[PDB]
Design a protein around this ligand. Sequence first.
Ligand SMILES: O=c1ccn([C@@H]2O[C@H](COP(=O)(O)OP(=O)(O)O)[C@@H](O)[C@H]2O)c(=O)[nH]1
Ligand SMILES: O=c1ccn([C@@H]2O[C@H](COP(=O)(O)OP(=O)(O)O)[C@@H](O)[C@H]2O)c(=O)[nH]1
Ligand SMILES: O=c1ccn([C@@H]2O[C@H](COP(=O)(O)OP(=O)(O)O)[C@@H](O)[C@H]2O)c(=O)[nH]1
Ligand SMILES: O=c1ccn([C@@H]2O[C@H](COP(=O)(O)OP(=O)(O)O)[C@@H](O)[C@H]2O)c(=O)[nH]1
Ligand code: NA
Ligand code: NA
Ligand code: NA
Ligand code: NA
Lengths: 355, 368, 362, 360
Amino acid sequence: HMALRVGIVYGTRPEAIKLAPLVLALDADPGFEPVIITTGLDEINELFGLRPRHNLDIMRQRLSAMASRIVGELGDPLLDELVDVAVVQGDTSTAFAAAYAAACERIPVAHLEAGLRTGDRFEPFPEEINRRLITQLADLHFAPTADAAGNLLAEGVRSDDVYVTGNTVIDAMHLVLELDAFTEGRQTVLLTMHRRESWGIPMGRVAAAVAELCRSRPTLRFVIPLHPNPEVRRVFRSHLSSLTQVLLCEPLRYSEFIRLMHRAVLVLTDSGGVQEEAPTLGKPVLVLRDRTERPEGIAAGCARLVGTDPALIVKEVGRLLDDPEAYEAMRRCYGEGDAAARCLEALRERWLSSP
Amino acid sequence: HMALRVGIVYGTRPEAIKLAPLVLALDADPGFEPVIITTGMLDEINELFGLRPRHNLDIMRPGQRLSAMASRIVGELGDPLLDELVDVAVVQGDTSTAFAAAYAAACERIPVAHLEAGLRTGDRFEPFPEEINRRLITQLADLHFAPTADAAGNLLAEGVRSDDVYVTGNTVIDAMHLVLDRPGDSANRELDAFTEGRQTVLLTMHRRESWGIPMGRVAAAVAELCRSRPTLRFVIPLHPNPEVRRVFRSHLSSLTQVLLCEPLRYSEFIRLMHRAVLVLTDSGGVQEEAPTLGKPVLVLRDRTERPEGIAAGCARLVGTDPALIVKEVGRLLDDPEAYEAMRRVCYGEGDAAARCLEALRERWLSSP
Amino acid sequence: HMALRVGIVYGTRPEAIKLAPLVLALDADPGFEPVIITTGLDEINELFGLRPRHNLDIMRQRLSAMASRIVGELGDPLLDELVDVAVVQGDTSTAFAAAYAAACERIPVAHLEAGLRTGDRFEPFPEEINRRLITQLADLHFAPTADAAGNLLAEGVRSDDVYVTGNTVIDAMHLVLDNRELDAFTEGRQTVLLTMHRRESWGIPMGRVAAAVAELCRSRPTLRFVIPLHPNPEVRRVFRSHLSSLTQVLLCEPLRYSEFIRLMHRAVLVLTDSGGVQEEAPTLGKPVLVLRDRTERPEGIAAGCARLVGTDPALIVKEVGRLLDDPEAYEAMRRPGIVCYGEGDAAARCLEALRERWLSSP
Amino acid sequence: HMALRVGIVYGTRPEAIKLAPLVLALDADPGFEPVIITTGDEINELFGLRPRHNLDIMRQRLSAMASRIVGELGDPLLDELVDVAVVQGDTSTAFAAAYAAACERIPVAHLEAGLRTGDRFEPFPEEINRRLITQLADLHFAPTADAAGNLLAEGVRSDDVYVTGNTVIDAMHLVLDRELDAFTEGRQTVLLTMHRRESWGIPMGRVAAAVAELCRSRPTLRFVIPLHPNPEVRRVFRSHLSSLTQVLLCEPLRYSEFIRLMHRAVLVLTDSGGVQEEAPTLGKPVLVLRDRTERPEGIAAGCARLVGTDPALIVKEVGRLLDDPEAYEAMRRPGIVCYGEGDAAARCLEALRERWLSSP
Ligand SMILES: O=c1ccn([C@@H]2O[C@H](COP(=O)(O)OP(=O)(O)O)[C@@H](O)[C@H]2O)c(=O)[nH]1
Ligand SMILES: O=c1ccn([C@@H]2O[C@H](COP(=O)(O)OP(=O)(O)O)[C@@H](O)[C@H]2O)c(=O)[nH]1
Ligand SMILES: O=c1ccn([C@@H]2O[C@H](COP(=O)(O)OP(=O)(O)O)[C@@H](O)[C@H]2O)c(=O)[nH]1
Ligand SMILES: O=c1ccn([C@@H]2O[C@H](COP(=O)(O)OP(=O)(O)O)[C@@H](O)[C@H]2O)c(=O)[nH]1
Ligand code: NA
Ligand code: NA
Ligand code: NA
Ligand code: NA
């Protein structure tokens, strides 16, 4: 019996984690077959049982060269694997270039995690322009919130093409629910920082803030899983590697990482995923950015913008550690953890029905 | 002294004609320098308007996949844009060049302006890829030169800030005016001989979705009208594709009432449109040009991105139904009341190049 | 003003000579534009004013590699030049591969010099199979004789697709009838013209023909031979090694078409395995002895203009002697009233066929 | 008679200007033949430089560029029968070309040798390039005694170091032999050039802000700003200053036009290495738009002052020089010569002749 062959295209850990619940749902349901094509991970592929049919070796590079290669070369594997529908996730240059490649072969596109907007043009670049381009290419939009759905309507998308499914990152969290020795019976702050526009001086300022807090509060601990880039590792290592209050880590497997987030007293991050995951475990989030495409957590008081100002990070972390009223004010946004299923029903409704 | 270096990227006759007025204005004004980069019939238009390309990427050929073409423009346009020290890039219309070039410009953080912005059919991926290209260019462009208020509205509906939209009108009107004051370059011996003191219908048809059977139906309609009306003449400049030429040639080449032509130089073509009693076309350009010369237009399509001419009664949808084409052409030839009902500016005054310049100056040649 | 863009594809001197009249006619008539694409000549291009738009550098080689490249690469130039119709000539692997390439792009094909058959399968190879393949690909067939038209009908071609136009090689002859040393050598002597090039005759059989020229030369001191040599070092060596000492023989480089037709006009008779020369020589009333065991030109055989002689030296000697001694046998091989292969207006008749087929509506 | 075939390798305007005097001297003297190989036309035409080969390598990752020059420059050096190669300055070309020459056992001379900031990999890769070229070169043409000292400190034998001065002074003299005049005529004109990559974005914005404040405060003051050919540099200046008719933003100027303008300027703001050498030689005070320089000679002699990208300090420092004629004359003090007399090409030739056209 005919399965809808659903192309799944990603290049990065974040995309893979958010797409994994949808791949698993597509694999479980007999009406669909997931066909994974990567542009890049093996740790996450193993954890969720993702088996790529093809790996283009494109990402290492100028944005134009990367986009050129994906547009040029993704058509063939999509045609060879007899893909009926392609799903791309998020704001990546892969999601955009893959969606354009799909459109060139008249393969309909669905967009997982659609409608997030900062409101500031080409800020960040190229993520903000990618979302707006994918938005025009996609036939179907899986919005994580009503706010996100509104942003799509404002860019001319028909209401019938938008499903508020919530975020699959919540599904993924639920599927995974020396580090213990280090955290056991201590107040532990979890920090991740990776955004390219923060590399160098601004990361130094955040590392300085962690240092000031550490000396001021001998019982305080930090765990910092480092983004796999030698420039990011060097700024943190050169600022914090001597302080035994800080445990610098290699990237953690998603299970180990979500477990650690569960034990943390609060979370400092510029991650989009962590901004969605941490509030769901009732951990206050201080966002190491000047803007966010996740204003829901800001408005609800789950999360506060803090940027890369060391004085403000120190103040804000202290406030939450000392004053339990301010702490509880940031605990009670992004879906129930059944988003994969709601995506499937949207796909079934759109491409597995007749009038 | 520092000039705003304005990149001008096109691949096709239609783009070149619409961009020519803007290139000329940029060349005349000392504050700007036009830098033409082509991705490509064109040398004729380049010569007529004095366009001198700085670079010609040899990317577009007849039998190429859309993905391969887009891939090459995205891959290769960056370097010439950087080497020529381009500050701002202008793309025109709905072409896959305009989209791929705009994306390439954006990758190098070169701001983009879109000439002829906001035209919409309202039907998704219809036609493909023109409708999706417009929507993609719309998100890439910092500045939008809309030809009408209707077009400006369509941009607002896709989330564009009002301050980024100028209603400049269509540069195709500028271009028309620049070739109507040029009778020597417009003189065509055999065309004049064929039309002089005869009722002449002008027909152009080129849209890919109409190739084969539908063009055959339109050629059948021209045949029926010709035999029924011995004094009636048709001039049909053929799109340079052998499959388009074969359908018209095989249906009409024996009728001496029909003159099948090679593509005509823009001057010769506008002159002919001026002498025509009415126009049958699926062309976007001709739908803008013909009403401006007070020629009724029958549009050989099921939809248009140009509803202004429909609403004003300048133009009527006719599709590729031979019965309806015959009826509609007859109506206009016999009944002078129906004819005058399709004549009276829908698409601007012919000063759009200048209005574009003032938008560029305002946006990228001013400081707080 | 709409011109039918007519692709002209060739790789060799023989194709170029036969296509030149058609190119000239297409250039003269305003309804058509010739678009030449070569797979290779400069001498012939200059003589007839042929100006190639593209030169693919394909022919120098295994048949499969050559065909593969033409099939692979000729489509693009045909599309770029906006060709409406492609013309190929004769039995060459270029004519076949080009016709297939044209057909892949849905470009209709016309075949110049269509329907010649030996009647023996894959003999010669690949010429005989090329003709039969081109025959199925072509929409339009310019047959040079009624016999050739019949052969096309027998392979299932519709009568309406066959025009008996005659051979353009006769047009080409007339266009060059409008050399110091050659005249000096022939002046007041009985001169035999010999050309031999067929690959299946290389080595021993050419040696036998060169032996026959030697025997005839020693036996008949007043007899002269002019032998323009095919441009291949193996062909040049067999003739040079057998005849370079005999001052009765003038071995030549390939001659410009004008010089060659002039020489054929002065010759008393012609020995050849050439298809072109078998068409040209009878038209100048020169008896032809064909250095082959078969011909695709049986019209000259039937009319007595030409006789099969093969590569048997005894028979060549006998047959050349017969014609030189006995003026009754000589006149029996001249029919200067009758034309086997057309009147020299074939280019025009091809144009009217193209106009009728692709520049009219029902 | 045998000419020493001297390879001349460059990829950029700055290298070409500094190498031009040496090429001309090599062309004039019959004992030498210059063989130009570029890795990159106005400058070539102006000085009559005729490249024998143009590798099309520079447009890109540093590793890919270096890899290509190391890989491919050997052949043209061998084909042109080069005996000795000269590289100039701190460019990745000068380094990769010098390494390529060394692989073919072609001796290397370094034009403009020994300039040091003293701060490691700052800037990158210029500072490491100088130290690598320094170990590859057999012969070092130092522009000052300070520079010669830096070479001795990195283990170079004293006999391999000639203090020749800077060829940029020669080049200036070779070009001192309409709208710009109209704009400057009878006005106090500041010349500003700024191009260093580490200053792109915010810091350039701060410098453009300083030009704006000075302009509004001093209606008679004029600025001419020839813009580095990069669209990000052009945008920051255009977006800050294009409305102020006291500022004339320019395209890159031909070397002659540029030196003429510098001659008419009252003072010079720059992060350029070349301009820091040229402007003092025309007695124009220089405010250096950087936090460090490889040219401390002008700092020490008072010809030039570090100013960085702080708008308050640029405003103060430009004002000081415009108002107080004592501070102005303190930055022209005739007597000390920081970067040579303009005869450096000749002194280079005598070093080449001495080293590779003599026998014991
Ligand atoms: O050591 C780590 C750090 C992060 N994450 C996961 O990585 C995702 C997002 O990290 P990223 O670097 O992608 O930031 P983003 O691109 O989402 O802004 C989230 O799902 C995290 O739970 C992880 O598994 N291990
Ligand atoms: O023989 C012709 C036919 C049309 N045009 C012009 O071509 C443009 C329209 O181009 P086309 O119809 O090929 O494309 P479209 O405009 O439909 O996108 C208009 O300005 C016409 O006046 C021309 O110059 N010569
Ligand atoms: O030295 C020569 C020999 C032949 N031909 C001409 O070449 C053509 C035939 O060439 P070939 O015999 O190689 O080809 P074939 O006719 O056997 O296919 C005929 O038109 C001859 O008139 C020529 O111009 N010069
Ligand atoms: O518009 C200009 C700007 C600079 N220069 C010259 O360029 C050289 C310095 O260029 P740049 O500042 O880019 O290089 P740097 O010296 O910092 O390497 C000097 O000799 C200047 O005279 C020029 O001719 N025109
Ligand atoms: Na399944
Ligand atoms: Na101008
Ligand atoms: Na002609
Ligand atoms: Na010399």
